[PDB]
Amino acid sequence: RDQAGITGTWYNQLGSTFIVTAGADGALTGTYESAVGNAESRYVLTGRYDSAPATDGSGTALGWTVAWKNNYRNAHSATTWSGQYVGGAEARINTQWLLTSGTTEANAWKSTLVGHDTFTKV
Amino acid sequence: RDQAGITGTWYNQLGSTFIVTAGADGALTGTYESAVGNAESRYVLTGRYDSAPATDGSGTALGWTVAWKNNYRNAHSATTWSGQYVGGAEARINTQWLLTSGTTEANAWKSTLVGHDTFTKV
Amino acid sequence: RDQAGITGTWYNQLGSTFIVTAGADGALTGTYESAVGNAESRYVLTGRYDSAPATDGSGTALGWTVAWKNNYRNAHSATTWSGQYVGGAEARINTQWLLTSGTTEANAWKSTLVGHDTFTKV
Amino acid sequence: RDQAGITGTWYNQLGSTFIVTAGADGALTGTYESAVGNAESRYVLTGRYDSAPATDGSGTALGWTVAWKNNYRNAHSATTWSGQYVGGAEARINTQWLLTSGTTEANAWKSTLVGHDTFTKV
Ligand SMILES: O=C1N[C@H]2[C@H](CS[C@H]2CCCCNC(=O)c2ccc3c(c2)C(=O)c2ccccc2C3=O)N1
Ligand SMILES: O=C1N[C@H]2[C@H](CS[C@H]2CCCCNC(=O)c2ccc3c(c2)C(=O)c2ccccc2C3=O)N1
């Protein structure tokens, strides 16, 4: 599997830092530090990955969540990243993400941002 | 907070069943059973929620992930749901989701489905 | 085809009004009036639809765009709706949408909202 | 405005070709040729852009639609791209997109792909 390939420190195009441990069972646990937004220091993350991916050259599906509350700040929001790990000399995690803020019902139509992050080991 | 409001069994518009425990610290843990797709029985989920939401009538941001591997099937894919819990007499979890499949690099452009699920307690 | 089924006035869950003419060639032209956001009166829309859909009970794919500039306001943003028309006694257009604002490069990560609108004829 | 900056031929990361004319009034018209998918030759596109963007360094919001029917093929689907044009020496159009296929109601949950394309003039 890709437990060893996924475990470690990853960096996205914004300079954010994603530190993760992949468990043998499919668990992802770690911390996230965003270079942008209403965020400071590390936030807990948890997620899941496919611990027995296909053997045909396909990537490894995974996802995780951060709720943007820690001991320093609370942005009343959560981001989920959904994507796939691609191994090899220039390994990457290619993701799309959804960032939902708590809103009133009147403002729920503008609650959710969407974007895409690519994580590398360098 | 909404630990007690979120903890329990939820059902979406497709007939899927979302069983979750909210921890005092922001953790979400539980199981998901999809009424649709290449899925059978329960799958592990994990996520996060805002354990100290705003007090102005806003919803409570949260997200979770399921990797679609269990002891029965492996769809080589993962879904993340990002959304907000809205309390009250007809409590709901309103979500948008991203479902990424592991793909070859040539097919990565068609790796990710997007949709929206509303969960109720009934 | 669904030229006659799509042409006319549609209303979404927010109270917005979508007035459209479907051309024999796949064109969509009309106006949109949003019940929410930094918007007033009607805005031009244009789009495309599948003018020869499948005959197996599938919906009819379509999409359109509004740039949120008219003679009254300019929100420096554009929404695209992507979805499908479903005919019958309770015809609907089920959509997902992406609303991008012009931003500086530093803020591009938070440029795009995502949501979902359902349009009915009533 | 950016009528002259947007008008012309653009290429994305997949090798697709986007040929567009921007009108003084906010119109986008042209053709799209996809390097991937169930697509051959050129397809009509139409969209809208902000013809009076902010002057603070922000990008120019725009969107367009392609229904994937032409004289050669019909994929019973439509893509909308929502994004912003960024001018300068290395001008770009940064987009996110939604690709909806016509589906039966039972399959509507898996009707829509999401992705991101960056277009350059080179
Ligand atoms: O590494 C990274 N960093 C970024 C990406 C995805 S997570 C993100 C880092 C997130 C850090 C905590 N939230 C914020 O600061 C934040 C700032 C502004 C907005 C929101 C959140 C938000 O919810 C929102 C929702 C709906 C309409 C508008 C808005 C906003 O205007 N990748
Ligand atoms: O309760 C629920 N159930 C559903 C929603 C969101 S999770 C979903 C249940 C998911 C169950 C496991 N996956 C599947 O069966 C599955 C079936 C078909 C496709 C995919 C996955 C997929 O990745 C995909 C990605 C890119 C292009 C096309 C495709 C597919 O054509 N809410």
Ligand SMILES: O=C1N[C@H]2[C@H](CS[C@H]2CCCCNC(=O)c2ccc3c(c2)C(=O)c2ccccc2C3=O)N1
């Ligand atoms: O009928 C409808 N009405 C609505 C939906 C989809 S179109 C929408 C109506 C749109 C009317 C013109 N824009 C706005 O007022 C507007 C207001 C607030 C925001 C934005 C735009 C925006 O871009 C944005 C982008 C990124 C981060 C945060 C933000 C915002 O906070 N369906």
Ligand SMILES: O=C1N[C@H]2[C@H](CS[C@H]2CCCCNC(=O)c2ccc3c(c2)C(=O)c2ccccc2C3=O)N1
């Ligand atoms: O330049 C480009 N090219 C690409 C991107 C965005 S447009 C795209 C080019 C599109 C060309 C016409 N459609 C296709 O061939 C096509 C192929 C496979 C699928 C679909 C469409 C689809 O709807 C879909 C929807 C829901 C679940 C699964 C599926 C598919 O598995 N940028």
